[PDB]
């Protein structure tokens, strides 16, 4: 008898204009991610940050990455997760998921999407 369990998770964190801090409402989901990273010790996370299309290019490139790093930082510093298991990358505004022509649209683009994959 042989068996495997595969873990697949997606975490979505949203940010306010110019901010890269993790809102308190997202703490429970980050805690769950940490829990599963312990349950599946070989799991890794691909954290990708984004920004809306407003402002200078240099600002958003740094801001998108800062947002991804904030998520990684929470896992590393608050949950004892090894940093090497978490990759971070910023895409500025090059990958929107909503329309930047609207208030709510831009709100959706200011985000960090993290994909966690593992097996045991």
Ligand X SMILES: N[C@H](CCC[C@H](N)C(=O)O)C(=O)O
> Residue positions in the annotated binding site for meso-2,6-diaminopimelate?
18, 52, 54, 60, 67
* 34-53: contacts with its own copies (CB under 8 A): 36
Asked whether 91 and 64 are in contact (CB, 8 A), the reply is yes
Nearer CB in complex with its own copies: 29/61: 29
Place of tokens 């240099």: 58
* Two structure tokens written together for 3: 């068996």
Residue 74 — φ and ψ, nearest 5°? Answer: -60, -45
Assess 70 for contact with ligand X (CB under 6 A).
no
Piece of 34-42, 50-58, 69-77, 79-87 that binds ligand X (CB under 6 A): 50-58
| Per-residue CA distances from 104 to 14, 66, 95, 100 (Å) | 12, 22, 16, 8
Asked whether 36 and 116 are in contact (CB, 8 A), the reply is yes
Assess 102 for contact with ligand X (CB under 6 A).
no
Tell me the site size for ligand X, rule CB under 6 A: 9
| Sole binder of ligand X in the list 11, 13, 43, 63 (CB under 6 A) | 63
CB of 117 to ligand X, least distance (A): 27
| Sole binder of ligand X in the list 29, 36, 44, 55 (CB under 6 A) | 55
CB of 29 to its own copies, least distance (A): 4
Asked whether 68 and 90 are in contact (CB, 8 A), the reply is yes
């Amino acid at each position: 008898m042989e068996l495997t369990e595969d873990l697949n998770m997606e975490l979505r964190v949203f940010f306010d204009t110019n901010k890269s801090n993790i809102k308190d409402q997202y703490k429970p989901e980050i805690a769950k991610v940490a829990e599963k990273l312990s349950e599946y010790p070989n799991a890794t996370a691909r954290i990708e940050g984004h920004t809306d299309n407003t402002g200078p290019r240099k600002l958003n490139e740094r801001l998108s990455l800062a947002r991804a790093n904030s998520v990684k930082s929470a896992l590393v510093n608050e949950y004892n997760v090894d940093a090497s298991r978490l990759s971070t990358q910023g895409f500025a505004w090059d990958q929107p998921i909503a329309d930047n022509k609207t208030k709510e649209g831009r709100a959706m683009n200011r985000r960090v999407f993290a994909t966690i994959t593992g097996s045991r």
